[PDB]
Amino acid sequence: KQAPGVSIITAEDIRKRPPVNDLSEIIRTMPGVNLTRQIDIRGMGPENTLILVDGKPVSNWVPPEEVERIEVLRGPAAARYGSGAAGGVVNIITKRPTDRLRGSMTVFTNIPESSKDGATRRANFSLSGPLTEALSFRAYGSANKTDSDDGVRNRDLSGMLSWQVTPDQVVDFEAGFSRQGNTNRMYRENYAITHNGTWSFGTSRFVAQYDSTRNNRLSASKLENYRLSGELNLPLHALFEQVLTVGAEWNKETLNDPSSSPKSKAEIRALYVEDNIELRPGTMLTPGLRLDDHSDFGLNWSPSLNASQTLGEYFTVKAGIARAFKAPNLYQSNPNYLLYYLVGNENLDAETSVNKELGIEFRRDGWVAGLTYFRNDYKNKIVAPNILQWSNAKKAVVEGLEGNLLVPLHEDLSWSTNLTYMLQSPEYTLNSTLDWQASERLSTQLTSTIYGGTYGIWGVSAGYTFSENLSVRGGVSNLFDKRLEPGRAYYVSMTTSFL
Numbered sequence: 184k185q186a187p188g189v190s191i192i193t194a195e196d197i198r199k200r201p202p203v204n205d206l207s208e209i210i211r212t213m214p215g216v217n218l219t220r221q222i223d224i225r226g227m228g229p230e231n232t233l234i235l236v237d238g239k240p241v242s243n244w245v246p247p248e249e250v251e252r253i254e255v256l257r258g259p260a261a262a263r264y265g266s267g268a269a270g271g272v273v274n275i276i277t278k279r280p281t282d283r284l285r286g287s288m289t290v291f292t293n294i295p296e297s298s299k300d301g302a303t304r305r306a307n308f309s310l311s312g313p314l315t316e317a318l319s320f321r322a323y324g325s326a327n328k329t330d331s332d333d334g335v336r337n338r339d340l341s342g343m344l345s346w347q348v349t350p351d352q353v354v355d356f357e358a359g360f361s362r363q364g365n366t367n368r369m370y371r372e373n374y375a376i377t378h379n380g381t382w383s384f385g386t387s388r389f390v391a392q393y394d395s396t397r398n399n400r401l402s403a404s405k406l407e408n409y410r411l412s413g414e415l416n417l418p419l420h421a422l423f424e425q426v427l428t429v430g431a432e433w434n435k436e437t438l439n440d441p442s443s444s445p446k447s448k449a450e451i452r453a454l455y456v457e458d459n460i461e462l463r464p465g466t467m468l469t470p471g472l473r474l475d476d477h478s479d480f481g482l483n484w485s486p487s488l489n490a491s492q493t494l495g496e497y498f499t500v501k502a503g504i505a506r507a508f509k510a511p512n513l514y515q516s517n518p519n520y521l522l523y524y525l526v527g528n529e530n531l532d533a534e535t536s537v538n539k540e541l542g543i544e545f546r547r548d549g550w551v552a553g554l555t556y557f558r559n560d561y562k563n564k565i566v567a568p569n570i571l572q573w574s575n576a577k578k579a580v581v582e583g584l585e586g587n588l589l590v591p592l593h594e595d596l597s598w599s600t601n602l603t604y605m606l607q608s609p610e611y612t613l614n615s616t617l618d619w620q621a622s623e624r625l626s627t628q629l630t631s632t633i634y635g636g637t638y639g640i641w642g643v644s645a646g647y648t649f650s651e652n653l654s655v656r657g658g659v660s661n662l663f664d665k666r667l668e669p670g671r672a673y674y675v676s677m678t679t680s681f682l
């Protein structure tokens with residue numbers, strides 16, 4: 184669940200700690216992740232956290248209760264994903280069509296104790312199952328209302344049709360929309376086709392994708408992405424046991440917005456090679472290189488080396504180093520667009536960064552303890568300083584510790600804490616959870632988050648499971664109503680399902 188540079192959140196994790204709005208509320212508890220309200224990894228800023236859904240990029244994403252696992256990748260091992268990934272990758276993984284029919288609903292409602300703060304109700308479903316020996320489907324969708332504190336609506340739906348062409352091949356057809364109101368409106372639609380083959384010589388995954396997004400204003404603007412993607416994984420035994428991965432991306436984004444020659448385009452080509460090599464049982468060496476060619480901005484090399492060595496049964500060491508970048512977007516690279524103003528800038532350079540990490544983990548008898556040092560050294564962060572202009576920031580450093588501790592206090596009691604500590608050119612967060620499996624069915628959390636001048640915020644949380652079909656969860660957040668961010672608030676959730 185925790186290792187160096189990488190964190191994993193489970194359905195069971197989310198299910199115990201229902202968010203109020205989006206998954207950022209849970210993802211921010213992972214080591215090296217803050218909200219600044221958008222996800223920020225290892226100090227690097229939001230614009231360098233990359234958000235994929237089933238490995239596909241996207242620019243509440245996914246109903247929490249529909250998420251199977253969230254994978255968080257930080258720092259060097261995340262360079263491979265290109266621009267937007269210098270701080271790392273959040274990868275949100277969904278539930279998938281199944282040989283048997285499957286429904287779930289969820290209702291959740293969070294009521295602030297202060298009427299100043301505004302209440303939330305959200306609501307979602309997932310249906311999945313077979314049609315045919317060769318066809319399977321899965322639909323999920325959500326509706327979300329959040330009153331204005333003295334509101335805002337979201338609706339999304341996404342469908343997947345899955346076709347088993349062969350026992351060794353699957354195509355996925357996907358499509359759906361998200362819509363948001365409150366005036367400010369946004370409508371987004373999405374199409375994808377996916378081929379996954381398992382072959383004698385390894386595996387393959389090709390992706391086509393289209394995204395539109397329209398935004399209305401208190402004038403309209405439309406954005407569209409085309410993507411193509413190929414990835415091979417070929418295990419080899421030559422010299423040493425290893426798994427060669429080869430991958431290519433092609434990417435077009437178009438923007439039309441007559442708040443400013445109203446159209447703007449950009450194409451992206453890339454190759455990457457990672458080779459994960461077993462030098463010896465217990466030692467992993469994993470070089471890789473990624474070429475990103477940008478239509479405005481030329482070429483960007485992102486070479487990386489990562490490695491791991493085991494130190495007996497109970498310890499492991501991990502280090503890596505990698506170059507990474509962020510290319511500017513169409514708003515920032517084009518002087519004709521003015522936002523309120525701030526102006527694009529045709530002579531912008533891409534942010535570059537050299538990200539280094541080194542960590543140890545201990546693991547024994549349900550005990551887990553990791554510490555990781557990181558240091559990122561980055562250049563031309565794009566930043567806003569009358570008519571202002573997007574600019575390149577001068578050099579900077581980030582450096583922290585990530586720690587993760589997990590302690591079984593008893594068979595059905597466990598204590599867990601997650602630490603993030605950085606200096607930039609000296610703050611820390613601590614996220615802790617005391618968990619009690621009182622019964623098979625009954626489950627209890629105390630949770631705290633401590634910022635550091637330092638201050639504290641504690642929640643309590645309870646859950647009961649009647650059956651496969653029904654379960655219930657309820658909780659107080661900000662127990663002690665610490666103010667001078669949200670006050671104390673009561674929430675309650677019900678999940679029905681017919682697996």
Ligand SMILES: CCCCCCCC
């Ligand atoms: C099944 C193909 C649907 C394509 C819709 C295109 C709308 C512009």
